[PDB]
Amino acid sequence: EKPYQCDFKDCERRFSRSDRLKRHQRRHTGVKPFQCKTCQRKFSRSDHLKTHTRTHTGEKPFSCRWPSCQKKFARSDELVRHHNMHQ
């Protein structure tokens, strides 16, 4: 069940926990509570701030597993796309 309904104009989204609704509603309000301390860009979410910060350090914790391919990536989804490309 998903009783936490979004009531913004024309929106039908519904969620199972209050914070999931709150997270979603930032897409309507444009509120960005989290700020990068390196470049001062602001973000709606702390998880997306965290992956953003890897753009400044070069940290790429996700490594391709194909032999003789040295490629690494900042996020899991970039590695999925890459592994899909090797086939």
Next chain:
DNA sequence: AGCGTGGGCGT
């Protein structure tokens, strides 16, 4: 390619 960001789901 690299990464913003919206949403599912977890602890």
Next chain:
DNA sequence: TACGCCCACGC
């Protein structure tokens, strides 16, 4: 609630 994962879409 804080914090964060994964996946998917769109530049």
